[PDB]
Design an enzyme around this catalytic site. Structure first.
Site, PDB file in Angstrom:
ATOM      1  N   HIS A   1       3.050  -5.625   7.515  1.00 46.93           N
ATOM      2  CA  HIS A   1       2.353  -4.426   7.791  1.00 46.93           C
ATOM      3  C   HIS A   1       1.809  -3.701   6.495  1.00 46.93           C
ATOM      4  O   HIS A   1       0.823  -2.677   7.027  1.00 46.93           O
ATOM      5  CB  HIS A   1       3.183  -3.630   8.687  1.00 46.93           C
ATOM      6  CG  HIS A   1       4.110  -2.611   7.872  1.00 46.93           C
ATOM      7  ND1 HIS A   1       5.226  -3.131   7.552  1.00 46.93           N
ATOM      8  CD2 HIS A   1       3.927  -1.417   7.631  1.00 46.93           C
ATOM      9  CE1 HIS A   1       5.798  -2.303   6.671  1.00 46.93           C
ATOM     10  NE2 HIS A   1       5.172  -1.036   6.888  1.00 46.93           N
ATOM     11  N   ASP A   2       2.118  -3.717   5.550  1.00 42.58           N
ATOM     12  CA  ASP A   2       1.742  -2.978   4.435  1.00 42.58           C
ATOM     13  C   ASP A   2       1.254  -3.785   3.073  1.00 42.58           C
ATOM     14  O   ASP A   2       1.282  -3.563   2.052  1.00 42.58           O
ATOM     15  CB  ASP A   2       2.752  -1.960   3.756  1.00 42.58           C
ATOM     16  CG  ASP A   2       2.830  -0.541   4.476  1.00 42.58           C
ATOM     17  OD1 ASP A   2       1.650  -0.212   4.782  1.00 42.58           O
ATOM     18  OD2 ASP A   2       3.720  -0.022   4.535  1.00 42.58           O
TER      19      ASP A   2
ATOM     20  N   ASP B   1       8.794   1.769  10.898  1.00 37.92           N
ATOM     21  CA  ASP B   1       7.933   2.101   9.786  1.00 37.92           C
ATOM     22  C   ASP B   1       8.238   3.569   9.150  1.00 37.92           C
ATOM     23  O   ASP B   1       8.082   3.948   7.978  1.00 37.92           O
ATOM     24  CB  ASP B   1       6.525   1.996   9.888  1.00 37.92           C
ATOM     25  CG  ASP B   1       5.680   2.051   8.831  1.00 37.92           C
ATOM     26  OD1 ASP B   1       5.936   1.727   7.938  1.00 37.92           O
ATOM     27  OD2 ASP B   1       4.410   2.518   9.035  1.00 37.92           O
TER      28      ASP B   1
ATOM     29  N   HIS C   1      10.227  -2.109   1.028  1.00 38.44           N
ATOM     30  CA  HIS C   1       9.788  -1.263   2.069  1.00 38.44           C
ATOM     31  C   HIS C   1       9.598  -2.384   3.405  1.00 38.44           C
ATOM     32  O   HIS C   1      10.093  -2.198   4.497  1.00 38.44           O
ATOM     33  CB  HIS C   1       8.707  -0.547   1.905  1.00 38.44           C
ATOM     34  CG  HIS C   1       8.045   0.263   3.310  1.00 38.44           C
ATOM     35  ND1 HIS C   1       8.633   0.978   4.117  1.00 38.44           N
ATOM     36  CD2 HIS C   1       6.719  -0.081   3.822  1.00 38.44           C
ATOM     37  CE1 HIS C   1       7.974   1.347   5.102  1.00 38.44           C
ATOM     38  NE2 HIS C   1       6.781   0.646   4.706  1.00 38.44           N
TER      39      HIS C   1
ATOM     40  N   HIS D   1       5.626   1.596  -1.254  1.00 36.79           N
ATOM     41  CA  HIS D   1       4.868   0.742  -0.661  1.00 36.79           C
ATOM     42  C   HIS D   1       4.864  -0.670  -1.238  1.00 36.79           C
ATOM     43  O   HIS D   1       4.015  -1.108  -1.810  1.00 36.79           O
ATOM     44  CB  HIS D   1       3.582   0.980  -0.349  1.00 36.79           C
ATOM     45  CG  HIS D   1       3.403   2.010   0.878  1.00 36.79           C
ATOM     46  ND1 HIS D   1       3.030   3.231   0.575  1.00 36.79           N
ATOM     47  CD2 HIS D   1       3.502   1.976   2.065  1.00 36.79           C
ATOM     48  CE1 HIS D   1       3.286   3.829   1.719  1.00 36.79           C
ATOM     49  NE2 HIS D   1       3.673   3.269   2.589  1.00 36.79           N
TER      50      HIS D   1
HETATM   51  C1  LIG Z   1       2.462   9.208   4.304  1.00 36.29           C
HETATM   52  C2  LIG Z   1       3.320   8.027   5.401  1.00 36.29           C
HETATM   53  C3  LIG Z   1       3.939   7.058   4.246  1.00 36.29           C
HETATM   54  C4  LIG Z   1       4.188   8.715   6.136  1.00 36.29           C
HETATM   55  N1  LIG Z   1       5.500   9.228   5.468  1.00 36.29           N
HETATM   56  C5  LIG Z   1       5.400  10.485   4.943  1.00 36.29           C
HETATM   57  O1  LIG Z   1       4.399  11.175   5.283  1.00 36.29           O
HETATM   58  N2  LIG Z   1       6.563  11.175   4.441  1.00 36.29           N
HETATM   59  C6  LIG Z   1       6.612  12.535   4.138  1.00 36.29           C
HETATM   60  C7  LIG Z   1       7.585  10.379   4.328  1.00 36.29           C
HETATM   61  O2  LIG Z   1       8.696  10.680   3.654  1.00 36.29           O
HETATM   62  C8  LIG Z   1       7.468   9.145   4.592  1.00 36.29           C
HETATM   63  N3  LIG Z   1       8.773   8.032   4.505  1.00 36.29           N
HETATM   64  C9  LIG Z   1       8.101   6.932   5.054  1.00 36.29           C
HETATM   65  N4  LIG Z   1       6.622   7.225   5.522  1.00 36.29           N
HETATM   66  C10 LIG Z   1       6.576   8.738   5.308  1.00 36.29           C
HETATM   67 MG   LIG Z   2       1.387   1.408   6.247  1.00 34.27          MG
HETATM   68 ZN   LIG Z   3       4.854   0.819   6.035  1.00 34.04          ZN
END
Ligand SMILES: CC(C)Cn1c(=O)n(C)c(=O)c2nc[nH]c21
Ligand SMILES: [Mg+2]
Ligand SMILES: [Zn+2]
Length: 317
Positions: A114-115, A224, A78, A74
């Site tokens: 968004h993050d 996302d 990303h 994050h």
């Molecule tokens: C938790 C959230 C970031 C959603 N999420 C997730 O659960 N997994 C397992 C991923 O590999 C992933 N990649 C992006 N977002 C993800």
């Molecule tokens: Mg987020």
């Molecule tokens: Zn995100």
């Protein structure tokens, strides 16, 4: 030199195989700013909204630098990746022929922010450790509300839209909020079920602002979690990074007896199973519905990649 190689890459900013990792290396970590500024120009937003390019760069830099580069997943890269994906979706026929410059403006800002200022840990962790953000947002979409209000703060501080009416700036804040809040994965069932229902009824009217923004919210949700929809070489890197972040949270939880969160135990949860489950239960359902809405080559390409990448992880077992 590397800066010149960066310009060339932007000529293919609309390609699903765009390599954001290389782009960020070439720009010395300026991917979000360079890419987003380019998209504002490409979509004619600078001219459409009489934007001051000096304020635009400042705003984008504020956003980029407010992401924690120390987070393995994050971070600003990303965000840049999600923005690039959102751009590809905006080029899809049904959206391209219905969105207005205002919609594009909001979509890109929402994707880029968004993050924003993500701490590298999830909501349940913030709640059980009594973090001030959990109290501030009453244990409801804690992270997403934080990203949104953080984005609002930067919008106001930059004065990027100071020349537009107050009502317009307030509406911008609200609509961007609706987009960012839709990215709370814990509520995917609600958004997906609604989207699915509309597709079943076949009553989506893209010239209607509310219907169009539901679609934009779904597009951002797709952006996302589209990592598995990218070609293997890109998808693999994303999977390693997100798992690294999850496991780090797990290490903290184990070290301080906080209880280890799901998907965060490096000792009992395999990266292979984490990715497979994510692709099967969250990614494929969402992209299958998206494919119903936008039945294009891109949608089939994305689903094709999830299938292949999913098989690759099963193979690594
Ligand atoms: C938790 C959230 C970031 C959603 N999420 C997730 O659960 N997994 C397992 C991923 O590999 C992933 N990649 C992006 N977002 C993800
Ligand atoms: Mg987020
Ligand atoms: Zn995100």
């Amino acid at each position: 030199d590397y800066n010149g190689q960066a310009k060339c890459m932007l000529e293919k900013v609309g390609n699903w195989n765009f390599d954001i990792f290389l782009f960020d290396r070439l720009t010395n970590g300026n991917s979000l700013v360079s890419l987003t500024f380019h998209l504002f120009s490409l979509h004619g937003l600078i001219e459409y909204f009489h934007l001051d390019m000096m304020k635009l760069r400042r705003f984008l830099v504020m956003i980029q630098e407010d992401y924690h580069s120390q987070n393995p997943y994050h971070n600003a890269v990303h965000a840049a990746d999600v923005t690039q994906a959102m751009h590809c979706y905006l080029k899809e026929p049904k959206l391209a022929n219905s969105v207005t410059p205002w919609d594009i403006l909001l979509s890109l800002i929402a994707a880029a922010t968004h993050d924003l200022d993500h701490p590298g840990v999830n909501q349940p962790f913030l709640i059980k450790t009594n973090h001030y953000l959990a109290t501030l947002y009453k244990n409801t979409s804690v992270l997403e509300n934080h990203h949104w209000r953080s984005a609002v703060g930067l919008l106001r501080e930059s004065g990027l839209f100071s020349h537009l009416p107050l009502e317009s700036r307030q509406q911008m804040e609200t609509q961007i909020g609706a987009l960012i809040l839709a990215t709370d994965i814990s509520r995917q069932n609600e958004y997906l079920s609604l989207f699915r229902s509309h597709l079943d009824r076949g009553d989506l009217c893209l010239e209607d602002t509310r219907h169009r923004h539901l679609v934009l919210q779904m597009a951002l949700k797709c952006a996302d979690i589209c990592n598995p929809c990218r070609t293997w070489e890109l998808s693999k890197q994303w999977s390693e990074k997100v798992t690294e972040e999850f496991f780090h949270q797990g290490d903290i939880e184990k070290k301080y007896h906080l209880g280890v969160s799901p998907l965060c135990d490096r000792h009992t949860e395999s990266i292979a199973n984490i990715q497979i489950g994510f692709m099967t239960y969250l990614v494929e359902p969402l992209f299958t519905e998206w494919a119903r809405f936008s039945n294009t080559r891109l949608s089939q390409t994305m689903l094709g990649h999830v299938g292949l990448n999913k098989a690759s992880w099963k193979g690594l077992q």
